[PDB]
Amino acid sequence: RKEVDPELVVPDPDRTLAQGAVAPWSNGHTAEYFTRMMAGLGEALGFDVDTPWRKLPAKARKAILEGADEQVHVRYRNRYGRTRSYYADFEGVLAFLQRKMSQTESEQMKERYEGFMRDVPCPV
Amino acid sequence: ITGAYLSGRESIEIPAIRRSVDPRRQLTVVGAREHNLRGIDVSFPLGVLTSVTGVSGSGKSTLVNDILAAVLANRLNGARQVPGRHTRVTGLDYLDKLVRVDQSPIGRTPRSNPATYTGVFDKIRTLFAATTEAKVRGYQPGRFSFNVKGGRCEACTGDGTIVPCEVCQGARYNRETLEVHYKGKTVSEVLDMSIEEAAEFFEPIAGVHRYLRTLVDVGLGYVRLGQPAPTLSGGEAQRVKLASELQKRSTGRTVYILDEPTTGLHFDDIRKLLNVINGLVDKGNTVIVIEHNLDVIKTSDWIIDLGPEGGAGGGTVVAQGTPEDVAAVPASYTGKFLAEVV
Amino acid sequence: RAGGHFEVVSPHAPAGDQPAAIDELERRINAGERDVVLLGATGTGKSATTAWLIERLQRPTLVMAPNKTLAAQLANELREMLPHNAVEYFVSYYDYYQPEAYIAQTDTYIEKDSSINDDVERLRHSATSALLSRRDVVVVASVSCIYGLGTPQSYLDRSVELKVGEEVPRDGLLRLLVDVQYTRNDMSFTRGSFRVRGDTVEIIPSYEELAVRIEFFGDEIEALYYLHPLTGEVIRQVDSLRIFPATHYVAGPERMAHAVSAIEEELAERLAELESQGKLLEAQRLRMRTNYDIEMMRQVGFCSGIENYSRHIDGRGPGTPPATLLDYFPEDFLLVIDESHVTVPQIGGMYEGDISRKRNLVEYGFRLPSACDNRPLTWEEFADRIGQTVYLSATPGPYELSQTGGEFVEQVIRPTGLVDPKVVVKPTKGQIDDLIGEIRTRADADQRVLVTTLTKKMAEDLTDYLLEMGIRVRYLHSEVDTLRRVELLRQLRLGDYDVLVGINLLREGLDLPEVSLVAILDADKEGFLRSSRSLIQTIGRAARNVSGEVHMYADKITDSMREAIDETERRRAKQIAYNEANGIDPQPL
Amino acid sequence: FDKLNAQGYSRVRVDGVVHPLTDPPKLKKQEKHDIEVVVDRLTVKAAAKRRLTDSVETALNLADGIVVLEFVDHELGAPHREQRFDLEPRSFSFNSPYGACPECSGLGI
Ligand SMILES: [Zn+2]
């Protein structure tokens, strides 16, 4: 589990963050499903929802990598008409994606997303 | 066809306007410090046949496909790919949709057909169930497929020919379902009939007309609708879809990322494809294509070369502009190739 | 076509002048006069008196409505009042609507785009089946009924009778069911589709919700029964039944051939006109659209926009009135129009706008002139086609008064105890402080006040000022959608504010039991959308309250407003005099 | 049987007795039944295939390919003419013990 490179989940310091910088934030229906509480956490912490990370410091990218603990009230509907309640605590995108691996019912993406942007090799 | 390329009368420079580029209505990418890149600024024009070229593995694919196509796919149509190591894409207010067509050699399973994955076979079943006889006999579009147990006889076991099925007699449809003679023909009759002579068919009904017309615009209407993938040569699996994957919203600046037609189709087939591209680009479409040949991208109006040397010796833009402009520059080998033959 | 009995449950006891109005209407209607006008204000039980005329006349009746909000309420009330008789409802089966129009000034072409519903077309087919199955039938319909439709005789020809122990081949029965647009769906059982299992067939009509089993034995019906589609609770059982088509445009194959020939004639004429005009792109788009539609329902039968060719089904020439719902009713039927004061002007204005957009389409290559013929009924052909015409509205329409010569019948008096609002007239300026004082004094009751203006700018200036000094306010705009004021209704029944302001989005179903004071601001000026009818409508809106009030501000005084105030005051005096004798408290039932 | 009535069959044959589906007889968890329910009330006729198919083919999707044409008469002389719609597929193998001599491990005599 060495993979290609870290930081690959959000390696963009200049994109429009409201346009789905992170891949789970841009899905067909899960896009808003995660953008809801991720924008909530962005408002709570204090980093903007759409401003590129170069007008802002790189601390915005670092603090979306590490995130923060605790959960907030959040619920929204997708384009497909369903209603999923992703109520869990995630420590930034590094542990949010790990939560996706350890929680989601999609047995394919739960290992597809780990390879490109998660590096947890064998320590022993 | 290979001889027709050299003695072309069609693989010529074909001078376009080349001024449909815009100083402001234009996309930029900067700072892409990928393992295959360095962080250069690529200036993609809009409303043009811009072609990204350079040595493969020098970062052109990681920028155009892994970075650009990924981001506009995931938040401009609803895809899922990771953006990758980059910083910026501009013209967000000037972009509406994106369609990506890969090389995708995928034709190996008999289940996949040029009409089943394209999403047109279900509509064909719906249209056939819209007939009076299919209504009285209680046959539904789902019942009228060949993969579900309802419509496939156990004698064929689903393959049509085993010596064919005794009951079906080489038609791949049980007698209880073949009675549906809509427009004097059945599904087996339509599948057997060639698309070239079926161009007059499905003309009124819109979606099948569009699919068939764009397939004929490609010029390869020899295939049948239910043709098994083992009999389809690798390379043309996504060409049929790519025909219809080049005009959305009729703006038509909606960007289409193209694979290499050189893989598979030879340069005369690629020049017919080029005629299609030029016609609908004059209509207003936009294509970003990674290519390997010379005259096909010489016909285009804008060339961007990313990396002169393979491996670590690339990752930076060395030219951007008219094919003759990059030709005059003795740095990009793409331009050098476009310069030795004018 | 058999005449039944209008068994009406009427727990409400007639009081005072209601029988007098009823037999005055009877005496007028038995004279055979083609023109009849009735003045029934809001809250006067117009539905009850209309139903009583229905019972007395014993004829199929057609109710004319201008919008869905009034039509649905009338339909449900009329269904409640008549248990046995099949009360009906007929409106366009589209939630979202975008008419195909072509604004030439902005060069904006809005296409055909809607949102199909499922609970209203079933009621429409129930209306047709009841109308052509039993004579004693009432149908309330919106303006969509005056659009293109099929003929009654051709659609009736396709209704098929069945009975227990009769010779009926299964193949013929299924062919007839499919010919009336019932696709046999087995795994999924939904309206417009029927399934078969062994020797039994589960059938659901386009009007009823409960399924029916038809059980056979060879080429003969064994029995018929009803059941609940899901719970399986047995209700009743019958010997004989009848089946009706699931679409309103069913007729014999020769009628399809004649309609196709008429389509060919119309498309040839339109192609020649467009070739003369030189509009190649528009003509091409129109020709592809027509080829698509015409060929695909020549091969199938169902399409989008078939109404444009409905004339070709009807066998009528261009320029004649398209076949409508009144043709379904026989020549010995009764029609009544509700809210005619805004329905007949709505008919005229809607016909004008639709014919303008239809010219912008047909002339600029979007539709054939058959689509121009496929239109709401013009008033000339409407008069040429209608029989004993009855009008009903809260106010006497000028057109109706001119047609009737001024002689009308007045029943706006409410036995329930409703009176017209008091009137206060003040200058336009020097009014905000008085309004603030009045709302401070009146806010203890927690009611709502509606205000109006002329155009948007000073209106919104008033809104943000009047939310600034400490009052919660809500406003209306020109593009109000359904949700943003249905939520307003919910939060006003929750008592979340006190004042609403609106210019034009206030006459459509904005009923509220707790609106007392209404303010009209500088509406005295001339306007195509601000003449006397809006002032009388707001007066009636205040009147429906137990105690209304109007505060009316004018720089100048016109004759229309003062005559409206005078007639409102005299009607209020008459209502007060009547109620002083009818002092019994209201007894709803 | 309530769900079957909701679907609609109008026929049943349980506990050795035939009823309409609207008439359910007594059933117990300690009672063993050879459930062979009915699907129709048709009979042999000329050019009646379109009928009989609709009685059997759909049953093929519910009975898992089981359907008969039994006498349902009095005499029951023949056992339903042996009419139904030792054999076993097993598995094909020679070296594996799937299809060899279980006692001698498939070796020669
Ligand atoms: Zn077969």
CSV table of C-alpha atoms in Angstrom, one decimal, chain B residues 88-298:
chain,number,residue,atom,x,y,z
B,88,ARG,CA,-6.5,25.5,-12.0
B,89,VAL,CA,-9.0,25.2,-14.9
B,90,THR,CA,-10.6,28.4,-16.1
B,91,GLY,CA,-13.6,29.2,-18.2
B,92,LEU,CA,-16.0,27.7,-15.7
B,93,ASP,CA,-18.7,30.2,-16.8
B,94,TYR,CA,-17.9,29.4,-20.5
B,95,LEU,CA,-18.4,25.6,-20.2
B,96,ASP,CA,-21.6,23.6,-20.1
B,97,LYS,CA,-20.9,19.9,-20.8
B,98,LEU,CA,-18.1,17.5,-21.5
B,99,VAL,CA,-18.0,14.1,-23.2
B,100,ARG,CA,-15.0,11.7,-23.0
B,101,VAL,CA,-14.5,8.8,-25.5
B,102,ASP,CA,-11.5,6.6,-24.6
B,103,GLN,CA,-9.7,4.1,-26.8
B,104,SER,CA,-11.6,1.4,-24.8
B,105,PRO,CA,-11.0,-2.0,-26.4
B,106,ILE,CA,-14.0,-3.6,-24.7
B,107,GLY,CA,-15.6,-5.9,-27.2
B,108,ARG,CA,-15.3,-9.5,-26.0
B,109,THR,CA,-18.6,-10.7,-24.5
B,110,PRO,CA,-21.5,-11.9,-26.7
B,111,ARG,CA,-24.0,-10.0,-24.4
B,112,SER,CA,-22.6,-6.6,-25.4
B,113,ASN,CA,-23.8,-5.4,-28.8
B,114,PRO,CA,-23.7,-2.1,-30.7
B,115,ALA,CA,-27.3,-1.6,-29.8
B,116,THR,CA,-27.6,-2.9,-26.2
B,117,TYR,CA,-25.0,-0.8,-24.3
B,118,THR,CA,-25.8,2.2,-26.4
B,119,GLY,CA,-29.2,2.4,-24.7
B,120,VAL,CA,-31.2,2.1,-28.0
B,121,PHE,CA,-32.3,-1.5,-27.7
B,122,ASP,CA,-34.6,-0.8,-24.7
B,123,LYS,CA,-36.2,1.9,-26.8
B,124,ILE,CA,-36.5,-0.5,-29.7
B,125,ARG,CA,-38.3,-2.9,-27.4
B,126,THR,CA,-40.6,-0.1,-26.2
B,127,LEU,CA,-41.4,0.9,-29.8
B,128,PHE,CA,-42.1,-2.8,-30.8
B,129,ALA,CA,-44.4,-3.2,-27.7
B,130,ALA,CA,-46.2,-0.1,-28.9
B,131,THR,CA,-47.7,-2.3,-31.6
B,132,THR,CA,-51.2,-3.7,-31.3
B,133,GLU,CA,-50.2,-7.4,-31.5
B,134,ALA,CA,-47.6,-7.0,-28.7
B,135,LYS,CA,-50.3,-5.3,-26.7
B,136,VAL,CA,-52.9,-8.1,-27.1
B,137,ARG,CA,-50.5,-10.9,-26.5
B,138,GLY,CA,-49.3,-9.2,-23.3
B,139,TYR,CA,-45.7,-8.8,-24.3
B,140,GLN,CA,-43.7,-5.9,-22.7
B,141,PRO,CA,-40.4,-4.3,-23.6
B,142,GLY,CA,-38.6,-6.2,-20.8
B,143,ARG,CA,-40.3,-9.4,-22.0
B,144,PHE,CA,-39.1,-8.5,-25.5
B,145,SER,CA,-35.3,-8.7,-24.7
B,146,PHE,CA,-33.0,-11.6,-25.5
B,147,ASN,CA,-31.1,-11.7,-22.2
B,148,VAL,CA,-34.0,-12.1,-19.7
B,149,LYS,CA,-35.6,-15.5,-19.3
B,150,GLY,CA,-39.0,-14.3,-20.5
B,151,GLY,CA,-38.0,-13.7,-24.1
B,152,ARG,CA,-35.3,-16.3,-24.7
B,153,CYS,CA,-36.2,-19.9,-25.5
B,154,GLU,CA,-34.4,-22.6,-23.6
B,155,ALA,CA,-33.6,-24.5,-26.8
B,156,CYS,CA,-31.1,-21.8,-28.0
B,157,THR,CA,-29.9,-21.3,-24.4
B,158,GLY,CA,-29.6,-17.6,-25.5
B,159,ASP,CA,-26.9,-17.8,-28.1
B,160,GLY,CA,-29.2,-18.2,-31.1
B,161,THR,CA,-27.0,-20.9,-32.7
B,162,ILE,CA,-25.8,-23.9,-30.9
B,163,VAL,CA,-26.5,-25.8,-35.9
B,164,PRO,CA,-29.1,-23.3,-34.8
B,165,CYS,CA,-32.1,-23.9,-32.6
B,166,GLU,CA,-34.6,-26.3,-34.1
B,167,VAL,CA,-37.6,-24.2,-33.1
B,168,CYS,CA,-36.1,-20.8,-34.1
B,169,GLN,CA,-34.5,-22.1,-37.3
B,170,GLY,CA,-31.7,-19.5,-37.2
B,171,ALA,CA,-33.7,-16.5,-36.0
B,172,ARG,CA,-33.1,-16.4,-32.2
B,173,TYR,CA,-36.8,-15.8,-31.3
B,174,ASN,CA,-39.4,-18.3,-30.1
B,175,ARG,CA,-42.6,-18.7,-32.1
B,176,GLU,CA,-44.7,-17.2,-29.2
B,177,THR,CA,-42.9,-13.9,-29.7
B,178,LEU,CA,-42.0,-13.8,-33.4
B,179,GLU,CA,-45.7,-13.2,-34.3
B,180,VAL,CA,-45.2,-9.4,-33.7
B,181,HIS,CA,-44.9,-8.2,-37.3
B,182,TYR,CA,-44.7,-4.5,-36.6
B,183,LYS,CA,-44.3,-2.6,-39.9
B,184,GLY,CA,-44.3,-5.9,-41.6
B,185,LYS,CA,-41.1,-6.9,-39.9
B,186,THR,CA,-39.9,-8.5,-36.7
B,187,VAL,CA,-36.9,-7.8,-34.4
B,188,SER,CA,-35.0,-10.6,-36.1
B,189,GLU,CA,-35.8,-9.2,-39.5
B,190,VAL,CA,-34.7,-5.7,-38.5
B,191,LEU,CA,-31.5,-7.1,-37.0
B,192,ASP,CA,-30.7,-9.1,-40.1
B,193,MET,CA,-31.3,-6.1,-42.4
B,194,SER,CA,-28.2,-3.9,-42.9
B,195,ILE,CA,-28.2,-0.4,-41.5
B,196,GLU,CA,-27.2,1.0,-44.9
B,197,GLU,CA,-30.5,-0.2,-46.4
B,198,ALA,CA,-32.3,0.6,-43.0
B,199,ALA,CA,-31.5,4.3,-43.2
B,200,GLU,CA,-35.0,4.8,-44.6
B,201,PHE,CA,-36.3,3.0,-41.5
B,202,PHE,CA,-36.8,4.7,-38.1
B,203,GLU,CA,-36.8,8.1,-39.9
B,204,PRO,CA,-39.8,9.6,-38.1
B,205,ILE,CA,-39.1,8.4,-34.6
B,206,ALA,CA,-36.5,10.8,-33.3
B,207,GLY,CA,-33.9,9.0,-31.1
B,208,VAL,CA,-33.3,5.9,-33.2
B,209,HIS,CA,-33.2,8.3,-36.2
B,210,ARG,CA,-30.4,10.3,-34.6
B,211,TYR,CA,-28.4,7.2,-33.6
B,212,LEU,CA,-28.7,5.7,-37.1
B,213,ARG,CA,-28.0,8.9,-38.8
B,214,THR,CA,-24.9,9.6,-36.8
B,215,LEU,CA,-23.8,6.0,-37.3
B,216,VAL,CA,-24.2,6.5,-41.1
B,217,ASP,CA,-22.3,9.8,-40.8
B,218,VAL,CA,-19.4,7.8,-39.4
B,219,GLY,CA,-19.7,5.7,-42.6
B,220,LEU,CA,-19.6,2.2,-41.0
B,221,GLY,CA,-23.3,1.1,-41.2
B,222,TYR,CA,-22.2,-2.5,-42.1
B,223,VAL,CA,-22.7,-3.7,-38.5
B,224,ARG,CA,-26.0,-5.2,-37.2
B,225,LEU,CA,-27.7,-4.0,-34.1
B,226,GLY,CA,-27.3,-7.3,-32.2
B,227,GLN,CA,-23.8,-8.1,-33.3
B,228,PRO,CA,-21.9,-10.1,-30.6
B,229,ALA,CA,-18.7,-8.5,-29.2
B,230,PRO,CA,-16.4,-11.5,-30.0
B,231,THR,CA,-17.0,-10.7,-33.7
B,232,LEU,CA,-16.4,-7.0,-33.2
B,233,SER,CA,-12.8,-6.0,-33.8
B,234,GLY,CA,-11.1,-4.1,-31.0
B,235,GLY,CA,-11.1,-0.4,-31.4
B,236,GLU,CA,-14.5,0.3,-33.0
B,237,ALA,CA,-16.5,-0.6,-29.8
B,238,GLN,CA,-16.9,3.1,-28.8
B,239,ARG,CA,-16.9,4.6,-32.2
B,240,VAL,CA,-20.6,4.1,-32.6
B,241,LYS,CA,-21.3,5.9,-29.4
B,242,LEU,CA,-18.7,8.5,-30.2
B,243,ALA,CA,-20.7,9.4,-33.3
B,244,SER,CA,-23.6,10.5,-31.1
B,245,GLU,CA,-21.1,11.8,-28.4
B,246,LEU,CA,-20.2,14.9,-30.4
B,247,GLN,CA,-23.3,17.2,-30.4
B,248,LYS,CA,-25.0,18.1,-27.1
B,249,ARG,CA,-27.0,21.3,-26.6
B,250,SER,CA,-26.1,22.5,-30.1
B,251,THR,CA,-24.1,25.3,-28.5
B,252,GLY,CA,-22.0,23.3,-29.6
B,253,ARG,CA,-18.8,24.3,-27.8
B,254,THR,CA,-19.4,21.4,-25.4
B,255,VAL,CA,-15.9,19.8,-25.2
B,256,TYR,CA,-15.4,16.3,-26.5
B,257,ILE,CA,-12.2,14.5,-25.5
B,258,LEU,CA,-11.1,12.2,-28.4
B,259,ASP,CA,-9.0,9.0,-28.4
B,260,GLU,CA,-6.7,8.1,-31.3
B,261,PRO,CA,-8.6,7.0,-34.4
B,262,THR,CA,-5.2,5.8,-35.7
B,263,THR,CA,-5.7,2.7,-33.5
B,264,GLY,CA,-8.0,0.7,-35.7
B,265,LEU,CA,-9.3,3.0,-38.4
B,266,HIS,CA,-6.8,4.0,-41.1
B,267,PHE,CA,-6.3,7.5,-42.3
B,268,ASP,CA,-9.1,7.5,-44.9
B,269,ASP,CA,-11.6,6.4,-42.2
B,270,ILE,CA,-10.0,9.1,-40.0
B,271,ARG,CA,-10.4,11.6,-42.8
B,272,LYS,CA,-14.1,10.8,-43.0
B,273,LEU,CA,-14.2,11.2,-39.2
B,274,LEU,CA,-12.4,14.5,-39.8
B,275,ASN,CA,-15.0,15.6,-42.3
B,276,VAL,CA,-17.6,14.9,-39.6
B,277,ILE,CA,-15.6,16.8,-37.0
B,278,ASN,CA,-15.0,19.8,-39.3
B,279,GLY,CA,-18.7,20.0,-40.2
B,280,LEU,CA,-20.0,20.0,-36.7
B,281,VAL,CA,-17.2,22.3,-35.5
B,282,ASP,CA,-18.4,24.7,-38.1
B,283,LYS,CA,-21.7,24.0,-36.4
B,284,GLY,CA,-19.9,25.1,-33.2
B,285,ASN,CA,-18.5,22.0,-31.6
B,286,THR,CA,-15.2,21.7,-29.7
B,287,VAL,CA,-12.8,18.7,-29.7
B,288,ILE,CA,-9.6,18.0,-27.7
B,289,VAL,CA,-7.8,15.1,-29.3
B,290,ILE,CA,-4.6,13.2,-28.5
B,291,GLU,CA,-3.3,12.1,-31.9
B,292,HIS,CA,-0.3,10.3,-33.5
B,293,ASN,CA,-0.5,11.0,-37.3
B,294,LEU,CA,0.4,14.1,-39.2
B,295,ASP,CA,-2.2,15.3,-41.8
B,296,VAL,CA,-5.2,14.6,-39.5
B,297,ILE,CA,-4.0,17.2,-37.0
B,298,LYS,CA,-2.6,19.4,-39.7
